[PDB]
């Protein structure tokens, strides 16, 4: 509660000051309070704060709430991931110049979504929770975790003194929430795969066009994924270290798989195989990433730094894979 006092009374530095306009941005050295501050600057500089009558008081409480609802004990999927995603998302709209391509309702939704896309993530993938018959699997059908992340997001927005949306007409609110649901679900890698093909072609065939309502909301999914794993597009020293966390969290799951599940983990989560990391990274980048960031640049050239940083790390992993 004092955390709210101190926060809702500190000066929010400029975006320039905070270097949040950068695709090459890092949080490693920021404090907790600083990250929250960036967030506020994000909302502010996207005009979300003024166009939706947000009270400094409320936004602050809300942000704080999301912060405290990411698990500390969880290796990669903690608050700094939600934060690094939203900053990527923010960088995309500004420097990548996409803001000029979509509505204020969409921007708001993307930001709120980016921030909460992994709420209460318990450091384990959809595959595991399904195969271990977690009650969450009994509750939700497909995109289990992502459904939960949203159930949470929404719980918080309905919390008292957290209604950062309170200012919206009922129609606005109603469709914002729709988009937010779509956004969070889109961060399910399975949907990214089962949908990206479609989108890769409209690009390929120089046919892709935002105006099209459907073509847009597809792209909005693709944009979510884009930011969700933007970490892979970071300077080597950063990519290095954040890959260290993904590493541990995976291995942590791998342990559970053979200790409670009594199965063998995939090599990627097989702690013992730590020496096959870099090729596993390479294959993943090839399979999941380059493909996507290429696309994103065709849509917006100013988004190229992402593609550049991506293949640049792929370069360094490949080298390593060859010892």
């Amino acid at each position: 509660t004092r955390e709210l006092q101190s926060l809702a009374a500190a000066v929010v530095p400029s975006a320039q000051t905070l270097k949040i306009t950068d695709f090459s941005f890092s949080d490693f050295e920021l404090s907790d309070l600083e990250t929250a501050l960036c967030t506020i600057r994000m909302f502010t500089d996207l005009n979300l704060v003024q166009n939706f009558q947000m009270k400094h008081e409320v936004l602050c409480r809300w942000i704080l709430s999301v912060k405290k609802n990411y698990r500390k004990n969880v290796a990669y999927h903690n608050w700094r991931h939600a934060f690094n995603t939203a900053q990527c998302m923010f960088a995309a709209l500004k420097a990548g110049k996409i803001q000029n391509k979509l509505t204020d309702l969409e921007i708001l939704a993307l930001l709120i979504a980016a921030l909460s896309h992994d709420l209460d993530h318990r450091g384990v993938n959809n595959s595991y929770i399904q195969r271990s018959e977690h009650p969450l699997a009994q509750l939700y059908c497909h995109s289990i975790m992502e459904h939960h992340h949203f159930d949470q997001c929404l719980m918080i927005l309905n919390s008292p003194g957290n209604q950062i949306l309170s200012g919206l007409s009922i129609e606005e609110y109603k469709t914002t929430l729709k988009i937010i649901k779509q956004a969070i679900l889109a961060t399910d890698l399975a949907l990214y795969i089962k949908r990206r093909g479609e989108f890769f072609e409209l690009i390929r065939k120089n046919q892709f066009n935002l105006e099209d309502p459907h073509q847009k909301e597809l792209f909005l999914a693709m944009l979510m994924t884009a930011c969700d794993l933007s970490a892979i597009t970071k300077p080597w020293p950063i990519q290095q270290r954040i890959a260290e966390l993904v590493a541990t969290e995976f291995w942590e799951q791998g342990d559970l798989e053979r200790t409670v599940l009594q199965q063998q983990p995939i090599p990627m989560m097989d702690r013992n195989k730590r020496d096959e990391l870099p090729k596993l990274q390479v294959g993943f980048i090839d399979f999941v990433c380059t493909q996507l960031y290429e696309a994103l640049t065709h849509v917006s050239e100013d988004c190229f730094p992402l593609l550049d940083g991506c293949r640049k790390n792929r370069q360094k992993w490949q080298a390593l894979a060859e010892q």
């Binding site: 993938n125 959809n126 595959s127 890698l189 399975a190 795969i193 089962k194 990627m268 399979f287 999941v288």
Partner: peptide, 17 residues
């Protein structure tokens, strides 16, 4: 989570599905 059977190996060897 039903995908083409050819995809299935790659999908699984990464944390997906």
């Amino acid at each position: 989570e039903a995908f083409n059977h050819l995809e299935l190996h790659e999908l699984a060897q990464y944390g997906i599905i």
